């Protein structure tokens, strides 16, 4: 009851997925440009 | 009962997913143009 009244109940449940998905996708896609730079500098 | 009567019950349950999906997709796809600019400036 305490949680549903303005706590982790509606704090985390978005935080978890949004932060995880955003950070993972952004880091992988930023590594994409690193892979492409390696492509350019190799062949 | 209080929540279902005009509160977080129907406030958050869209807010969470819409904000998360929109923000994540928009930030990743905006980083797409950054990756493409790096492509252009590299090779």
From TrEMBL, chains A, B:
Residues 5-25 are annotated as: Disordered. This is Portal protein. The chain holds residues 679 to 721 of 726 of the full protein.
């Amino acid at each position: 009851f305490l949680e549903q009244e303005s706590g982790v109940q509606q704090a985390r449940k978005r935080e978890l997925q949004q932060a995880q998905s955003e950070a993972q996708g952004k880091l992988a896609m930023l590594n994409s440009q690193l892979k492409r730079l390696d492509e350019a500098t190799s062949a």
